[PDB]
Design an enzyme around this catalytic site. Structure first.
Site, PDB file in Angstrom:
ATOM      1  N   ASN A  84      39.534  40.116  34.421  1.00  0.00           N
ATOM      2  CA  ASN A  84      38.162  40.352  33.957  1.00  0.00           C
ATOM      3  C   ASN A  84      37.760  39.442  32.782  1.00  0.00           C
ATOM      4  OD1 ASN A  84      37.362  42.130  35.972  1.00  0.00           O
ATOM      5  ND2 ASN A  84      37.885  43.955  34.809  1.00  0.00           N
TER       6      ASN A  84
ATOM      7  N   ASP B 175      37.838  48.555  31.555  1.00  0.00           N
ATOM      8  CA  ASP B 175      38.682  47.787  32.476  1.00  0.00           C
ATOM      9  C   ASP B 175      39.022  46.392  31.932  1.00  0.00           C
ATOM     10  OD1 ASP B 175      40.308  47.604  34.772  1.00  0.00           O
ATOM     11  OD2 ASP B 175      38.636  47.203  36.156  1.00  0.00           O
TER      12      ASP B 175
ATOM     13  N   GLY C 220      37.042  35.744  46.334  1.00  0.00           N
ATOM     14  CA  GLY C 220      37.979  36.842  46.155  1.00  0.00           C
ATOM     15  C   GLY C 220      37.344  38.189  46.407  1.00  0.00           C
ATOM     16  N   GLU C 221      38.122  39.260  46.208  1.00  0.00           N
ATOM     17  CA  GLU C 221      37.659  40.634  46.409  1.00  0.00           C
ATOM     18  C   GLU C 221      38.317  41.627  45.460  1.00  0.00           C
ATOM     19  OE1 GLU C 221      38.713  41.410  50.746  1.00  0.00           O
ATOM     20  OE2 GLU C 221      40.168  42.774  49.810  1.00  0.00           O
TER      21      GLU C 221
HETATM   22  C1  6R0 Z   1      41.988  35.394  46.428  1.00  0.00           C
HETATM   23  N1  6R0 Z   1      41.802  34.322  45.449  1.00  0.00           N
HETATM   24  C2  6R0 Z   1      41.247  33.140  45.753  1.00  0.00           C
HETATM   25  O1  6R0 Z   1      40.801  32.828  46.846  1.00  0.00           O
HETATM   26  C3  6R0 Z   1      41.240  32.291  44.511  1.00  0.00           C
HETATM   27  C4  6R0 Z   1      41.429  33.286  43.367  1.00  0.00           C
HETATM   28  C5  6R0 Z   1      40.171  33.641  42.561  1.00  0.00           C
HETATM   29  N2  6R0 Z   1      39.909  35.091  42.484  1.00  0.00           N
HETATM   30  C6  6R0 Z   1      38.773  35.482  41.617  1.00  0.00           C
HETATM   31  C7  6R0 Z   1      37.551  35.811  42.484  1.00  0.00           C
HETATM   32  C8  6R0 Z   1      36.369  36.286  41.643  1.00  0.00           C
HETATM   33  C9  6R0 Z   1      36.033  35.267  40.570  1.00  0.00           C
HETATM   34  N3  6R0 Z   1      34.808  35.601  39.849  1.00  0.00           N
HETATM   35  C10 6R0 Z   1      33.910  34.685  39.436  1.00  0.00           C
HETATM   36  N4  6R0 Z   1      34.212  33.390  39.675  1.00  0.00           N
HETATM   37  C11 6R0 Z   1      33.332  32.483  39.244  1.00  0.00           C
HETATM   38  N5  6R0 Z   1      32.186  32.684  38.593  1.00  0.00           N
HETATM   39  C12 6R0 Z   1      31.919  33.980  38.348  1.00  0.00           C
HETATM   40  N6  6R0 Z   1      30.803  34.466  37.732  1.00  0.00           N
HETATM   41  C13 6R0 Z   1      30.863  35.827  37.683  1.00  0.00           C
HETATM   42  C14 6R0 Z   1      31.982  36.271  38.321  1.00  0.00           C
HETATM   43  C15 6R0 Z   1      32.436  37.705  38.460  1.00  0.00           C
HETATM   44  C16 6R0 Z   1      32.454  38.174  39.923  1.00  0.00           C
HETATM   45  C17 6R0 Z   1      32.819  39.636  40.002  1.00  0.00           C
HETATM   46  O2  6R0 Z   1      31.914  40.439  39.232  1.00  0.00           O
HETATM   47  C18 6R0 Z   1      31.995  40.097  37.849  1.00  0.00           C
HETATM   48  C19 6R0 Z   1      31.576  38.665  37.615  1.00  0.00           C
HETATM   49  C20 6R0 Z   1      32.694  35.091  38.757  1.00  0.00           C
HETATM   50  C21 6R0 Z   1      37.220  35.058  39.642  1.00  0.00           C
HETATM   51  C22 6R0 Z   1      38.450  34.573  40.419  1.00  0.00           C
HETATM   52  C23 6R0 Z   1      41.158  35.785  42.145  1.00  0.00           C
HETATM   53  C24 6R0 Z   1      42.133  35.767  43.314  1.00  0.00           C
HETATM   54  C25 6R0 Z   1      42.243  34.417  44.022  1.00  0.00           C
END
Ligand code: 6R0
EC number: 2.7.11.1
Length: 279
Positions: free
Chosen positions: A144, A139, A30-31
């Site tokens: 989050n 935020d 994601g972004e």
């Molecule tokens: C477009 N999409 C897709 O293709 C699927 C869906 C998923 N998306 C998000 C992308 C970012 C993700 N983040 C993480 N996912 C796993 N492990 C993690 N560890 C630490 C983090 C964060 C990263 C950012 O900084 C803070 C720490 C993290 C949460 C879900 C939402 C929209 C949807």
């Protein structure tokens, strides 16, 4: 301490920052407004690599992460600053964000009321730890709040965290407290945002939806108070284990959190207390 990665190491483990989504065989998860998130593999272990696309938010994230270690806070494993690009490496959360799970994204089953109560308690414990360590998140939102292998809530994104007025108003509009939209920085703004998250947990509806009437979720609080509707009318129909008593108990906490006057809102310790009494 955190591991110091060179940019070439993160370049390879993310398959040369493969911008295609996971579903199409890429590495993009994601972004956001501050960067793209990629899935990485370091020594048979899965990681989340955030390539920032700004330096103050990188430094603030590392500073807050080094000071604050808790069960309900996402863990930072390392970083990269050697290139012209800034990267942050985190523990991979197999169950993504609370926002994605409430919307049943990519065929995931709906979260039960029991799991939702544990997530709300976990998230409150996370915010409590941040406030005890004199940090304001700024935020707080369901995107989050991350979910591990046991669906344990892990508060994420400490890039905007603060250890008061500002000229740069930052955050997510649908979750922000009125004074936060006004430029104020207070831990009471985090309480208000948590109140919006509690409404998302009860309803299964996102905080904002442009093709919905009403567009903003916090407006259902007005319909309930004006006796036009009840919280029972808004309970997520995708649950089979929600009981009226505990739902009304969580709504009471949400309602207290969503007071327009910041001084009338309970502190995070009281929110934590009311959520434990609920179960
Ligand atoms: C477009 N999409 C897709 O293709 C699927 C869906 C998923 N998306 C998000 C992308 C970012 C993700 N983040 C993480 N996912 C796993 N492990 C993690 N560890 C630490 C983090 C964060 C990263 C950012 O900084 C803070 C720490 C993290 C949460 C879900 C939402 C929209 C949807």
């Amino acid at each position: 301490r955190f591991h110091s990665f060179s940019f070439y190491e993160l370049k390879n483990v993310t398959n040369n920052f493969d911008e295609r989504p996971i579903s199409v065989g890429g590495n993009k998860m994601g972004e956001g407004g501050f960067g793209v998130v990629y899935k990485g593999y370091v020594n048979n272990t899965t990681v989340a690599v955030k390539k920032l696309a700004l330096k103050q938010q990188f430094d603030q994230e590392i500073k807050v992460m080094a000071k604050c270690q808790h069960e309900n806070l996402v863990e930072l494993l390392g970083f990269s600053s050697d290139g012209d690009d800034l990267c942050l490496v985190y523990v991979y959360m197999p169950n993504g964000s609370l926002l994605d799970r409430l919307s049943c994204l990519d065929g995931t089953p709906p979260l039960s009321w029991h799991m939702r109560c544990k997530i709300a308690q976990g998230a409150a414990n996370g915010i409590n730890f941040l406030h005890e360590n004199h940090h304001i998140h700024r935020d707080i939102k369901s995107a989050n709040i991350l979910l591990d292998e046991a669906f344990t809530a892990k508060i994420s994104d400490f890039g905007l965290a603060r250890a008061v007025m500002t000229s740069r108003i930052v955050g997510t509009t649908a979750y922000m407290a009125p004074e936060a939209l006004r430029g104020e920085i207070t831990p009471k703004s985090d309480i208000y945002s948590f109140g919006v998250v509690l409404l998302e947990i009860i309803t299964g509806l996102p905080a904002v939806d442009e093709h919905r009437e009403p567009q903003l979720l916090l407006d259902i609080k007005e319909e309930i108070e004006d006796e036009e509707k009840t919280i029972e009318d808004y309970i997520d129909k995708k649950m089979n284990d929600a009981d009226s008593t505990s739902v009304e108990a969580m709504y009471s906490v949400a309602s207290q959190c969503l007071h327009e006057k910041k001084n009338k809102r309970p502190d995070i310790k009281k929110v934590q207390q009311l959520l434990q009494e609920m179960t």
